[PDB]
C-alpha cells in the first residue's frame, strides 16, 4: 500500500474465515453391520462354477454391480472366515456382476461351499 | 339485504320526467337530517359526496326519505348488559325482522 | 482499478471547466481558526444521546409518579438544531442566530440554495470544510448543516 513494483494492480490478501459444519441433513438410521449382505448377493451353481471349486479352489458369486474388488474381499472376510487371494470380475450381458474368488489354499473351497449349502 | 338510497331525476330532455334511485345521499341532505356521514355509513345508509343539490325540491324529497327511515330504525345495543341512548330494548330484539325487498324500499316506499 | 481512475479524473474535470458562481461559492470556505472555534461551540451544545434521553424521561416519570399533580417540564436541555428540515424551518422563521453548512454534500442540490436563503433573511452563516467533521461535533456520522438559535449566558461573547 506504499510502493507498487508491478505494472498492474492485483487484489490484496485479506483474512478469510473458514466455513462451519452444519447439522446433518440426512437422519436415516443406517446399520453398519449389514452392508456385506448388500455386497454379496448369492452364489452360482453352473457347470463351469462347479469345475472351478474343486480344481482351482475358487468360488463364484453374483455381487452388486457397483462394488469393487477391495470391498468384495472385505465382504468375503466378514461373511465367511476365509481369506481371498484373488478376485476377478466381469459384467454379464444381462447386466449383473459376477466374481471369481480364489482362496488362499489354507482354506478349502469345497468345505466352504458345503457350509454355504451349495 | 339492501341499503337505503335516494331518489334522483333522470338527465336529458327525453327522460326529464322520470325518477329512479341514485347512488347515495349527499352530505348536505345528511346534515339537514342531522347525521354524521361516517356514522350513517354504519347503519345501512349509502353516502355519495360527489352529488350536488341545485334545487330545493330534490333536496326536500331526500330529507323526508331519511327522516322516515330514521323513525323506523331499531338499533341493537352493543352490549346486552347496558343500553345507551337511543338503542332498542330486548323486546324489539325479540321482535326483529328482515326486509328482503328487491330494492330495500319497504320502510320508505317507492 | 476503474473506480480509482474515475475518482481522480472527476477532480481534474471539475478544475478545468468554467464554474458558475452558485457552485463556485462552495470552494471558498471559512479559515482554520474560526472553523475550529465554531466546531468547539457546537460540540459543547451537542444534542443528548439515547441513554441520556432515557434517563431524563425515567426521572420525569418517577417525579410524576410521586406527584400526580404539578408540571413535569419535559423540555430537554438547550442544544443545537440538527437536520435539514428543522434547520430550514429555523432559517425561515428567523430563530437561528447562526448557520453552518458543509461544503461537500453529494448530491449538491440538497444545500445549494441555503446561502441564498440565509442572505435573504439576513442570517449569519458560514461554509466549512467537512460534513464528517460536523457529524463528529454533533455525535453522528454526517451532518449537512447545523443552526444555533440560543446559548447560555457564559458563551455570549464567543457567539
Amino acid at each position: 500500500r506504499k510502493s507498487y513494483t508491478r505494472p498492474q494492480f492485483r487484489r490484496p490478501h485479506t483474512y478469510r474465515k473458514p466455513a462451519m459444519a452444519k447439522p446433518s441433513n440426512r437422519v436415516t438410521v443406517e446399520s453398519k453391520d449389514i452392508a456385506a449382505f448388500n455386497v454379496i448377493r448369492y452364489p452360482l451353481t453352473t457347470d463351469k462354477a462347479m469345475k472351478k471349486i474343486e480344481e482351482n479352489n475358487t468360488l463364484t458369486f453374483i455381487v452388486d454391480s457397483r462394488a469393487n474388488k477391495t470391498e468384495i474381499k472385505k465382504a468375503m472376510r466378514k461373511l465367511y472366515q476365509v481369506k481371498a487371494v484373488k478376485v476377478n470380475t466381469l459384467i454379464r450381458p444381462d447386466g449383473l456382476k459376477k466374481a471369481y474368488i480364489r482362496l488362499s489354499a489354507a482354506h478349502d473351497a469345497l468345505d466352504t461351499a458345503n457350509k454355504i449349502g451349495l | 339485504l339492501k341499503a337505503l338510497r335516494p331518489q334522483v331525476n333522470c338527465p336529458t330532455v327525453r327522460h326529464n320526467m322520470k325518477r329512479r334511485l341514485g347512488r347515495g345521499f349527499s352530505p348536505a341532505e345528511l346534515k339537514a337530517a342531522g347525521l354524521n356521514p361516517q356514522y350513517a355509513a354504519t347503519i345501512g345508509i349509502r353516502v355519495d359526496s360527489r352529488r350536488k343539490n341545485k334545487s330545493e325540491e330534490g333536496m326536500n324529497v331526500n330529507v323526508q326519505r331519511l327522516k322516515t327511515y330514521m323513525s323506523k330504525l331499531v338499533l341493537f345495543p352493543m352490549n346486552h348488559k347496558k343500553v345507551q341512548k337511543g338503542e332498542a330494548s330486548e323486546e324489539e330484539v325479540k321482535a326483529a325482522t328482515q326486509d328482503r325487498s328487491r330494492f330495500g324500499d319497504a320502510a320508505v316506499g317507492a | 482499478p476503474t473506480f480509482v481512475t474515475m475518482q481522480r479524473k472527476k477532480r481534474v474535470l471539475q478544475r478545468r471547466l468554467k464554474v458558475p458562481p452558485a457552485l463556485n461559492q462552495f470552494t471558498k470556505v471559512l479559515d482554520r481558526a474560526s472553523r475550529n472555534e465554531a466546531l468547539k461551540l457546537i460540540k459543547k451544545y451537542a444534542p443528548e444521546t439515547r441513554k441520556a434521553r432515557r434517563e431524563r424521561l425515567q426521572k420525569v416519570a418517577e417525579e410524576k409518579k410521586k406527584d400526580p399533580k404539578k408540571t413535569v417540564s419535559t423540555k430537554a436541555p438547550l442544544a443545537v438544531v440538527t437536520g435539514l428540515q428543522e434547520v430550514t424551518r429555523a432559517i425561515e422563521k428567523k430563530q437561528a442566530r447562526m448557520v453552518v453548512i458543509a461544503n461537500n454534500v453529494d448530491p449538491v442540490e440538497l444545500v445549494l440554495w441555503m446561502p441564498n436563503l440565509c442572505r435573504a433573511n439576513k442570517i449569519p452563516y458560514a461554509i466549512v470544510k467537512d460534513m464528517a467533521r460536523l457529524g463528529d461535533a454533533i455525535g453522528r456520522k454526517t451532518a449537512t448543516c447545523v443552526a444555533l438559535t440560543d446559548v447560555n449566558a457564559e458563551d455570549e461573547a464567543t457567539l
Binding site: - | - | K10, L17, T88, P107, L110, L112, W113, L117
Partner: protein, 203 residues
C-alpha cells in the same frame, strides 16, 4: 420546507449551474456499467414522491438505455408481401424507453419487486433512469402495512406485464371517457366485447 426548494430547483434544468452539474454527471455515468447499484437516490425528493423510503428493504439502481428509433431486424433489409409493410428504418417501438429500462432491471434481478422509476440524465447516445425495488423477504417490508401489499404473488413481474406507471402511459390509461373508450379495460378486452357473436337462447 426544503422539499419546495429542491423541487423548484429541479424545475430549472436549463440554467447554467444545472447544466454544469448535469454535464459532470453525464460524463461520469457514461464510463460505468449498464446497470449500477446505488446507496442513496440521486433525487431524494422525486424518489420519495414515487414511493421510496429510507428503510431496510428498499434499493435503488441506475439503468442505461440507448436512444433513437427502432430498426426492423430483417435480413439484408429485405421485406416481402405488400408495400405497406416495407419500411425498415422509419418505424417506432410502441413501448417507451422508461418501460424498457424497468423491464431490463426486472429481468436481471428476479429476487426483487420493481416499484417505480424516474428520469435522471440525458446525453446524445444514452438516457439514464433510476429504478426503485423492494425485497419481499425482508421482515421490515413484510410487517409494514403501507408496503406489504407487494409481497403477494399477484405482483411478481408487474413491469413485465405493463402495470407500472410507464406501462400505463403507453397503454393509454392516462385518459378516460370519450378519449379512451376503445382501450378500456384493455384493447383486447374491448375488441373481444365488440367482435364476439352472440346467440341468445330464444331469437
Amino acid at each position: 420546507g426544503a422539499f419546495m426548494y429542491l423541487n423548484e430547483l429541479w424545475k430549472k434544468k436549463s440554467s447554467d449551474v444545472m447544466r454544469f452539474i448535469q454535464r459532470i454527471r453525464s460524463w461520469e455515468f457514461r464510463h460505468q456499467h449498464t446497470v449500477v447499484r446505488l446507496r442513496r437516490p440521486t433525487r431524494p425528493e422525486k424518489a420519495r414522491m414515487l414511493g421510496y423510503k429510507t428503510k431496510q428493504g428498499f434499493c435503488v439502481f441506475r439503468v442505461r438505455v440507448r436512444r433513437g428509433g427502432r430498426k426492423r431486424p430483417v435480413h439484408k433489409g429485405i421485406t416481402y408481401g405488400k408495400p405497406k409493410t416495407s419500411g425498415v428504418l422509419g418505424m417506432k417501438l410502441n413501448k417507451n424507453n422508461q418501460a424498457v429500462a424497468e423491464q431490463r432491471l426486472g429481468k436481471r434481478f428476479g429476487n426483487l419487486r420493481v416499484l417505480n422509476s424516474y428520469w435522471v440524465n440525458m446525453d446524445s447516445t444514452f438516457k439514464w433512469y433510476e429504478v426503485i425495488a423492494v425485497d419481499p423477504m425482508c421482515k421490515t417490508i413484510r410487517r409494514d402495512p403501507r408496503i406489504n401489499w407487494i409481497v403477494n404473488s399477484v405482483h411478481k413481474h408487474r413491469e413485465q406485464r405493463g402495470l407500472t406507471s410507464a406501462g400505463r402511459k403507453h397503454r393509454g390509461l392516462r385518459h378516460k371517457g370519450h378519449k379512451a373508450s376503445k382501450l378500456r379495460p384493455s384493447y383486447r378486452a374491448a375488441w373481444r366485447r365488440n367482435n364476439r357473436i352472440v346467440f341468445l337462447r330464444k331469437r
